[PDB]
């Protein structure tokens, strides 16, 4: 499956980073979502064509080994939610989710 | 930058117009025109 | 038939007046070369063959 | 009908024309895109 | 693009499940993927299955023995058939569009998933008596 930190604490204004780890992340592509409590998930990082870094706007992500770092630039107090990395298997048969990671804002 | 998966980005040395000066460039090739001996 | 790759070709000189070309880079939509064949046209062909065999 | 099967086609650059081993001709890659149209006239089958 | 779910609200245990998700304002409804994903309270997400308009479906293999997803395309509304409802499956369920863009021959696999852009209403799936 996937591997995440359970919760990440940071003050506003700094740069919070979340490391989604897991065995399928050797090869496959990683999603990202945002879900407010009591409401729907929101796709936050999608992708373009393959050699195009997906998309770089307000967030970014790098890759090193089986780890994928979720860079959050410019933390404020309004983005408080729970976050999720998503991928599939290298065999391309089924789709799994991350464990879930709470944003803790000071 | 990351994805899954016929091209090879190749480190490559070569001569120049002058006899001694070398040339470190890069190019692309396919699968079936290159062999493992990386 | 097609090779749908927008591709950049660069040129170098390897020695005393000997040019050389190489695939520099592609602009970015990695595809695979392929050929289309009209399906119903092709089945109409093979019925003629077994008619003689 | 209104259908089109599609074949996977590969690209090589180092050829050996008519199996004459020793001669190796290089393919210069060309710019733009590739389109060529051809009829089908002849077939080879082997019992 | 609009979407809306459809649910009964209260379901008894050991019975079945009939859900659907109606889609409108979609200029190309025919070339996306359509999927159900559920969520338990205070838990992670939980993928269920997916359907494409060719008719090819995949499923979560652990849940595969009790589920089925089917489809109407005239009304852009795809269904959901879960059987044998248990109280552990009480949660918040979602329909979603998983987009795919195309860089060439579909039959040769020259496509990629864009990502799941549009998410459903959510439904308080209550398995109780
Ligand atoms: C052998 O036979 C084969 C047939 O079996 C044949 O295969 C065919 O090959 C060709 C090419 O080889 C394939 O053509 C590709 O088709 C892709 C899909 O095109 C379809 O879909 C678009 C999408 O339209 C959406 O939006 C409009 C509103 O604007 C709606 O009205 C639509 O209904 C649809 O809406 C859906 O999507 C929305 C967005 O998610 C949803 O919100 C919404 O709810 C809807 O569900 C249609 O528009 C197309 O119809 C016509 O419209 C456009 C308008 O300009 C015309 O230009 C076009 O020609 C159509 O006539 C069509 O129905 C295309 O994406 C793809 O084009 C890309 O690549 C080319 C070349 O690189 C680019 O020039 C082009 O600009 C596109 O590049 C963009 O997108 C790619 C994404 O991968 C990026 O790589 C690229 O960087 C660029 O991205 C940029 O723009 C994006 C959007 O603009 C943006 O998101 C990016 O972030 C970035 O900014 C190409 O045309 C064809 O599918 C094959 N067919 C099959 C069946 O396989 C083969 O060729 C034959 N071979 C031979 C030799 O004969
Ligand atoms: C000689 O020719 C004959 C006929 O001309 C050939 O027989 C045919 O062979 C076909 C493939 O070998 C076979 O098609 C399959 O049939 C089943 C049941 O009908 C169907 O489910 C299959 O569809 C899957 O596979 C195709 C191609 O792989 C995919 O395009 C399709 O979407 C389905 O794949 C999905 O499920 C897989 C399950 O493991 C996933 O791995 C895969 O990634 C994919 O998931 C994606 O797509 C889903 C749909 O979009 C989506 O929800 C998901 O999220 C992912 O995006 C396929 O149609 C024919 O049944 C068979 N016909 C007969 C009569 O036997 C024969 O092979 C030829 N001879 C030889 C020797 O090759
Ligand atoms: C550069 O890219 C190429 C391809 O773009 C890549 O070559 C491929 O590497 C993979 C991984 O080493 C090979 O994948 C294998 O394929 C078979 C069938 O497809 C699978 O069954 C294999 O899975 C088994 O083996 C794994 C080995 O650790 C196990 O982890 C796994 O659980 C299974 O037991 C495996 O995925 C693929 O064969 C090659 N391709 C070729 C043509 O050889 C190459 O690795 C990339 N370069 C680098 C430096 O990584
Ligand atoms: C291979 O490619 C050629 C062209 O690259 C294809 O020829 C094209 O075929 C289509 C239909 O088969 C023609 O469209 C029709 O044109 C008539 C004439 O105006 C129009 O009235 C019809 O409504 C229809 O649009 C198209 O004109 C024709 N183009 C050329 C240049 O010949 C051919 O079909 C392709 N074959 C395969 C197997 O893909
Ligand atoms: C192959 O790898 C080389 C690594 O050096 C890439 O070359 C660099 O590309 C970046 C941006 O693409 C440039 O800013 C650098 O100047 C390049 N380096 C040199 C020495 O020129 C190259 O792009 C890769 N090939 C492909 C097709 O991406
Ligand atoms: C493939 O063969 C067909 C035979 O029907 C060719 O079509 C005709 O060719 C003659 C001479 O080449 C022309 O005078 C006619 O005007 C053609 N008719 C049509 C409807 O095109 C066709 O030219 C051949 N293909 C190629 C690429 O030459
Ligand atoms: C992705 O790679 C491209 C070229 O390979 C580079 O220009 C870009 O900075 C990279 N982006 C990230 C986020 O690493
Ligand atoms: C190319 O040459 C340089 C020095 O001339 C050397 O350091 C480098 O390792 C060479 N590249 C390869 C791939 O051997
Ligand atoms: C390929 O991309 C270049 C830009 O890098 C552009 O000038 C050229 O027109 C493109 N090729 C085609 C066939 O459009
Ligand atoms: C569909 O929604 C878009 C926004 O995504 C809106 O601009 C458009 O007016 C809607 N279509 C209709 C027919 O109202």
Would you give an account of this structure?
The structure is cut from a larger assembly and holds 1 copy of chain A (106 residues), 3 copies of chain B and 1 copy of chain E (129 residues). Chain A is mainly beta. Chain A is built from no helices and 10 strands. Chain B has 38 residues and is mainly β. Chain B is 0% helix and 42% strand. Chain B has a two-stranded antiparallel ribbon with strand order 1-2. Chain B is elongated, with a radius of gyration of 14 Å. By secondary structure, chain E is mostly beta strands. Helix content of chain E is 0%, strand content 53%. Chain E contains no helices and 12 strands. In chain E, strands 2, 4, 5, 6, 10, 11 and 12 form a 7-stranded mixed beta sheet that branches. In chain E, a hairpin with a 5-residue loop joins β5 (45-51) and β6 (57-59). The termini of chain E are far apart. Classes of the chains: A mainly beta (106), B mainly beta (38), E mainly beta (129). β3 of chain C pairs antiparallel with β1 of chain D. The structure holds a molecule of 10 linked components (NAG-NAG-BMA-MAN-MAN-MAN-MAN-MAN-...), a molecule of 6 linked components (NAG-NAG-BMA-MAN-MAN-MAN), a molecule of 4 linked components (NAG-NAG-BMA-MAN), a molecule of 3 linked components (NAG-NAG-BMA), a molecule of 2 linked components (NAG-NAG) (2 copies) and 2-acetamido-2-deoxy-beta-D-glucopyranose (4 copies). A molecule of 3 linked components (NAG-NAG-BMA) is lined by residues 36-38 of chain C. A molecule of 10 linked components (NAG-NAG-BMA-MAN-MAN-MAN-MAN-MAN-...) sits between chains E (1, 26-29, 32, 99, 101-106) and C (2, 4, 29, 36).
């Amino acid at each position: 499956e996937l591997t995440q930190p359970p919760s990440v604490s940071v003050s506003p204004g700094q740069t919070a980073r979340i490391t989604c780890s897991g065995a399928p992340l050797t090869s496959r592509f990683t999603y990202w979502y945002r879900q407010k409590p009591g409401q729907a998930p929101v796709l936050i990082i999608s992708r373009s064509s393959q050699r195009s870094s997906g998309w770089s706007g307000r967030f970014s992500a790098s890759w090193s080994g089986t780890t994928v770092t979720l860079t959050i630039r410019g933390v404020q107090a309004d983005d408080e939610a729970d976050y999720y990395c998503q991928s599939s298997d290298t065999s391309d048969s089924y789709k799994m989710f991350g464990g879930g990671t709470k944003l803790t804002v000071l | 930058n990351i994805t899954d998966d016929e091209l090879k980005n190749c480190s490559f040395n070569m001569t120049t117009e002058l006899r001694d000066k070398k040339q470190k460039v890069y190019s692309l090739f396919y699968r079936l025109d290159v062999v493992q001996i990386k | 038939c097609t090779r749908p790759n927008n591709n950049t070709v660069k040129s170098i000189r390897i020695g005393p007046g000997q040019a050389f070309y190489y695939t520099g880079d592609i602009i970015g939509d990695i595809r695979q070369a392929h050929c289309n064949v009209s399906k119903a046209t092709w089945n109409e062909t093979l019925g003629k063959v077994v008619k003689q065999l | 009908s209104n259908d089109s099967i599609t074949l996977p086609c590969r690209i090589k650059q180092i050829i050996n024309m008519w199996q004459r081993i020793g001669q190796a001709m290089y393919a210069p890659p060309i710019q733009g895109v590739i389109r060529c149209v051809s009829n089908i006239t002849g077939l080879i089958l082997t019992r | 693009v609009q979407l809306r779910e459809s649910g009964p609200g209260l379901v008894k245990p050991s019975e079945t499940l009939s859900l659907s998700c109606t889609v409108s304002n979609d200029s190309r409804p025919s070339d996306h993927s359509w999927t159900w994903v559920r969520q338990s309270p205070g838990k992670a997400l939980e993928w269920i299955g997916d359907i494409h308009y060719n008719g090819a479906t995949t499923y979560n293999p652990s849940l595969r023995s009790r589920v089925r997803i089917e489809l109407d395309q005239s009304i852009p509304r795809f269904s959901l058939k879960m059987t044998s409802m248990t109280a552990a499956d009480t949660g918040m369920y979602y329909c979603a569009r998983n987009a795919i863009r195309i860089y060439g021959v579909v039959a040769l696999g020259e496509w990629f998933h864009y990502g799941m852009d549009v998410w459903g209403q959510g439904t308080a799936v209550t398995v109780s008596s």
